Write a protein that holds these residues in place. Structure first.
Motif, PDB file in Angstrom:
ATOM      1  N   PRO A  59      16.663 -11.668-116.071  1.00 24.16           N
ATOM      2  CA  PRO A  59      16.366 -10.251-115.846  1.00 24.16           C
ATOM      3  C   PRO A  59      15.631  -9.676-117.053  1.00 24.16           C
ATOM      4  CG  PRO A  59      18.539 -10.412-116.727  1.00 24.16           C
ATOM      5  CD  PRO A  59      18.002 -11.848-116.646  1.00 24.16           C
ATOM      6  N   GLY A  60      15.368  -8.371-116.999  1.00 23.69           N
ATOM      7  CA  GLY A  60      14.672  -7.697-118.069  1.00 23.69           C
ATOM      8  C   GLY A  60      15.580  -6.916-119.020  1.00 23.69           C
ATOM      9  N   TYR A  61      14.913  -6.214-119.934  1.00 24.80           N
ATOM     10  CA  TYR A  61      15.559  -5.326-120.892  1.00 24.80           C
ATOM     11  C   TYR A  61      16.501  -4.331-120.217  1.00 24.80           C
ATOM     12  CZ  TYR A  61      15.661  -2.443-125.188  1.00 24.80           C
ATOM     13  OH  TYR A  61      16.018  -1.727-126.305  1.00 24.80           O
ATOM     14  N   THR A  62      17.750  -4.297-120.680  1.00 26.99           N
ATOM     15  CA  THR A  62      18.876  -3.474-120.234  1.00 26.99           C
ATOM     16  C   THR A  62      19.472  -3.957-118.922  1.00 26.99           C
ATOM     17  OG1 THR A  62      17.761  -1.749-118.913  1.00 26.99           O
ATOM     18  CG2 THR A  62      17.813  -1.434-121.292  1.00 26.99           C
ATOM     19  N   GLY A  63      18.892  -4.964-118.264  1.00 25.52           N
ATOM     20  CA  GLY A  63      19.332  -5.375-116.951  1.00 25.52           C
ATOM     21  C   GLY A  63      20.240  -6.603-116.984  1.00 25.52           C
ATOM     22  N   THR A  64      20.824  -6.884-115.824  1.00 26.05           N
ATOM     23  CA  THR A  64      21.715  -8.011-115.648  1.00 26.05           C
ATOM     24  C   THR A  64      21.269  -8.790-114.419  1.00 26.05           C
ATOM     25  OG1 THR A  64      23.328  -6.759-114.341  1.00 26.05           O
ATOM     26  CG2 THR A  64      23.580  -6.717-116.754  1.00 26.05           C
TER      27      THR A  64
ATOM     28  N   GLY B   1      11.155 -14.880-114.531  1.00 25.26           N
ATOM     29  CA  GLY B   1      11.848 -13.765-115.140  1.00 25.26           C
ATOM     30  C   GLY B   1      11.154 -12.464-114.836  1.00 25.26           C
ATOM     31  N   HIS B   2      11.917 -11.390-114.949  1.00 22.24           N
ATOM     32  CA  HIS B   2      11.412 -10.056-114.695  1.00 22.24           C
ATOM     33  C   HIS B   2      11.175  -9.364-116.027  1.00 22.24           C
ATOM     34  CE1 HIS B   2      12.295  -5.628-113.568  1.00 22.24           C
ATOM     35  NE2 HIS B   2      11.004  -5.870-113.439  1.00 22.24           N
ATOM     36  N   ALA B   3       9.988  -8.792-116.179  1.00 21.93           N
ATOM     37  CA  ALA B   3       9.639  -8.023-117.362  1.00 21.93           C
ATOM     38  C   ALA B   3       9.894  -8.824-118.640  1.00 21.93           C
ATOM     39  CB  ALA B   3      10.388  -6.688-117.332  1.00 21.93           C
ATOM     40  N   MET B   4      10.774  -8.349-119.526  1.00 22.82           N
ATOM     41  CA  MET B   4      11.051  -9.115-120.744  1.00 22.82           C
ATOM     42  C   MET B   4      11.447 -10.550-120.431  1.00 22.82           C
ATOM     43  SD  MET B   4      12.840  -7.020-123.852  1.00 22.82           S
ATOM     44  CE  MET B   4      12.134  -5.466-124.431  1.00 22.82           C
ATOM     45  N   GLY B   5      12.086 -10.776-119.283  1.00 20.76           N
ATOM     46  CA  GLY B   5      12.380 -12.142-118.880  1.00 20.76           C
ATOM     47  C   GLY B   5      11.148 -12.888-118.415  1.00 20.76           C
TER      48      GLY B   5
ATOM     49  N   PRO C 217       5.601  -9.178-116.119  1.00 21.95           N
ATOM     50  CA  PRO C 217       6.128  -9.587-117.423  1.00 21.95           C
ATOM     51  C   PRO C 217       5.751  -8.624-118.525  1.00 21.95           C
ATOM     52  CG  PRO C 217       4.111 -10.750-116.989  1.00 21.95           C
ATOM     53  CD  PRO C 217       4.429  -9.981-115.736  1.00 21.95           C
ATOM     54  N   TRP C 218       6.585  -8.628-119.558  1.00 25.54           N
ATOM     55  CA  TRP C 218       6.378  -7.843-120.762  1.00 25.54           C
ATOM     56  C   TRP C 218       6.522  -8.741-121.987  1.00 25.54           C
ATOM     57  CZ3 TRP C 218       8.445  -6.712-125.319  1.00 25.54           C
ATOM     58  CH2 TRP C 218       8.102  -5.510-125.952  1.00 25.54           C
ATOM     59  N   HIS C 219       5.565  -8.655-122.906  1.00 23.70           N
ATOM     60  CA  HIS C 219       5.628  -9.438-124.133  1.00 23.70           C
ATOM     61  C   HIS C 219       4.593  -8.905-125.118  1.00 23.70           C
ATOM     62  CE1 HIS C 219       6.249 -12.747-126.869  1.00 23.70           C
ATOM     63  NE2 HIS C 219       7.123 -13.299-126.046  1.00 23.70           N
TER      64      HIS C 219
ATOM     65  N   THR D  18       4.350   1.088-115.236  1.00 28.54           N
ATOM     66  CA  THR D  18       4.127   1.846-116.466  1.00 28.54           C
ATOM     67  C   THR D  18       4.877   1.282-117.661  1.00 28.54           C
ATOM     68  OG1 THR D  18       5.986   3.348-116.155  1.00 28.54           O
ATOM     69  CG2 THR D  18       3.898   3.947-115.086  1.00 28.54           C
ATOM     70  N   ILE D  19       5.733   0.295-117.442  1.00 32.35           N
ATOM     71  CA  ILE D  19       6.522  -0.299-118.507  1.00 32.35           C
ATOM     72  C   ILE D  19       5.792  -1.477-119.134  1.00 32.35           C
ATOM     73  CG2 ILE D  19       8.677  -1.500-118.968  1.00 32.35           C
ATOM     74  CD1 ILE D  19       8.752   1.644-118.509  1.00 32.35           C
ATOM     75  N   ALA D  20       5.217  -2.338-118.298  1.00 36.83           N
ATOM     76  CA  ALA D  20       4.347  -3.422-118.749  1.00 36.83           C
ATOM     77  C   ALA D  20       3.022  -3.326-117.998  1.00 36.83           C
ATOM     78  CB  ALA D  20       5.006  -4.782-118.540  1.00 36.83           C
TER      79      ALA D  20
ATOM     80  N   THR E 132       5.844  -0.598-108.528  1.00 42.73           N
ATOM     81  CA  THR E 132       6.195  -0.196-109.879  1.00 42.73           C
ATOM     82  C   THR E 132       6.837  -1.361-110.621  1.00 42.73           C
ATOM     83  OG1 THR E 132       8.432   0.620-109.366  1.00 42.73           O
ATOM     84  CG2 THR E 132       6.560   2.159-109.030  1.00 42.73           C
ATOM     85  N   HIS E 133       7.304  -1.078-111.839  1.00 38.35           N
ATOM     86  CA  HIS E 133       8.050  -2.032-112.653  1.00 38.35           C
ATOM     87  C   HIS E 133       9.332  -2.526-111.972  1.00 38.35           C
ATOM     88  CE1 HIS E 133      10.883  -2.970-116.027  1.00 38.35           C
ATOM     89  NE2 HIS E 133      11.643  -2.068-115.432  1.00 38.35           N
ATOM     90  N   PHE E 134       9.897  -1.761-111.032  1.00 42.03           N
ATOM     91  CA  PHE E 134      11.124  -2.165-110.356  1.00 42.03           C
ATOM     92  C   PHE E 134      10.883  -3.058-109.146  1.00 42.03           C
ATOM     93  CE2 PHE E 134      12.496   2.032-112.179  1.00 42.03           C
ATOM     94  CZ  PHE E 134      13.449   1.525-113.066  1.00 42.03           C
TER      95      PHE E 134
HETATM   96  O1  LIG Z   1       9.998   0.081-123.263  1.00 44.81           O
HETATM   97  C1  LIG Z   1       9.705  -1.132-123.338  1.00 44.81           C
HETATM   98  O2  LIG Z   1       8.894  -1.530-124.207  1.00 44.81           O
HETATM   99  C2  LIG Z   1      10.245  -2.027-122.416  1.00 44.81           C
HETATM  100  C3  LIG Z   1      11.095  -1.551-121.424  1.00 44.81           C
HETATM  101  C4  LIG Z   1      11.612  -2.434-120.482  1.00 44.81           C
HETATM  102  C5  LIG Z   1      11.260  -3.787-120.492  1.00 44.81           C
HETATM  103  C6  LIG Z   1      11.856  -4.610-119.545  1.00 44.81           C
HETATM  104  O3  LIG Z   1      11.982  -5.824-119.716  1.00 44.81           O
HETATM  105  O4  LIG Z   1      12.476  -3.906-118.568  1.00 44.81           O
HETATM  106  C7  LIG Z   1      13.205  -4.715-117.636  1.00 44.81           C
HETATM  107  C8  LIG Z   1      14.387  -3.920-117.066  1.00 44.81           C
HETATM  108  O5  LIG Z   1      15.191  -4.707-116.160  1.00 44.81           O
HETATM  109  C9  LIG Z   1      10.456  -4.281-121.511  1.00 44.81           C
HETATM  110  C10 LIG Z   1       9.914  -3.385-122.440  1.00 44.81           C
END
Ligand SMILES: O=C(O)c1ccc(C(=O)OCCO)cc1
Length: 261
Positions: free
Chosen positions: A58-63, A128-132, A154-156, A177-179, A207-209
């Motif tokens: 999962p991503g940041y703050t998620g499970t 993986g989702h976003a940070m994942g 993805p986010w990186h 808007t997050i990545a 969206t990001h979700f």
């Molecule tokens: O604000 C950020 O930079 C940022 C915010 C969120 C994320 C992310 O992985 O969200 C996944 C939530 O399940 C990555 C970067």
């Protein structure tokens, strides 16, 4: 002829349906029993056989709860899949890459015999989702032996993935808007070598979700990518090449690939 083939001949409908043809059961991985990650859930086909294996972050703050539908859906198409929790919800992408690796090893070496016996340990994938998804890119970079990688919106902070040679499908969301695809998903795709198997699929009105909501398009092409490269299942090439249309009346915002693979 291909003994890695599982399940019936695919169609758009069969790939877009909420579930594939395999009944699924779950193995709970407690945080206590998990070494190097935060626990999670292994989805696996009840039918006895060996299958490819996939770890999903999962991503940041998620499970794991935010990617559970994906673990279940992919497993019901003939894969052994772990949705992980991370050691903390704040772990950065490159830590997430380590935990995905630990989850692969957990499935292969530490899960119950029921799960270990259903895994072909030579055929692994990461998602993986976003940070994942960033964690997916890092792990694919560190393990050329992986068979597939699928970063979802993805986010990186690192934008250079020219070291990756794993077959990689990146899925972007136009309204993310997050990545934002302009500074994450697309630079990732463009820095991957032109010489590998890769694809960029950008969702329309997403969206990001979006990867956290059961999604026919994500479900279809994730499974197709896994089938093609984890199972060497050329029955699934028809969905990736030329791929979903991004033009008039098309199904996606953008699709780009290195077809033929
Ligand atoms: O604000 C950020 O930079 C940022 C915010 C969120 C994320 C992310 O992985 O969200 C996944 C939530 O399940 C990555 C970067």
């Amino acid at each position: 002829m291909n003994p890695y083939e599982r399940g019936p001949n695919p169609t758009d409908a069969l790939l877009e349906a909420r579930s594939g043809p395999f009944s699924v059961s779950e193995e709970n991985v407690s945080r206590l029993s998990a070494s190097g990650f935060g626990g999670g859930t292994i989805y696996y086909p009840r039918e006895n056989n060996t299958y490819g294996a996939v770890a999903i972050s999962p991503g940041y703050t998620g499970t794991e709860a935010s990617i559970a539908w994906l673990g279940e859906r992919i497993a019901s198409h003939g894969f052994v899949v772990i949705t992980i929790d991370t050691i903390t919800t704040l772990d950065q992408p490159d830590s997430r890459a380590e935990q995905l690796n630990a989850a692969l090893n957990h499935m292969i070496n530490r899960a119950s015999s029921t799960v270990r016996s259903r895994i072909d340990s030579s055929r692994l994938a990461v998602m993986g989702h976003a940070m994942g998804g960033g964690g997916s890119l890092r792990l694919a970079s560190q393990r050329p032996d992986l068979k597939a990688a699928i970063p979802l919106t993805p986010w990186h902070l690192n934008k250079n993935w020219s070291s990756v040679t794993v077959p990689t499908l990146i899925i972007g969301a136009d309204l993310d808007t997050i990545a934002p695809v302009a500074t994450h998903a697309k630079p990732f795709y463009n820095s991957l070598p032109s010489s590998i198997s890769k694809a960029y699929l950008e969702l329309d009105g997403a969206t990001h979700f979006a990867p956290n909501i059961p999604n026919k398009i994500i479900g279809k092409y994730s499974v197709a990518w896994l089938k093609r490269f984890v199972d060497n299942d050329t029955r699934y090439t028809q969905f990736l090449c030329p791929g979903p249309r991004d033009g008039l009346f098309g199904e996606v915002e953008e699709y780009r690939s290195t077809c033929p693979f």
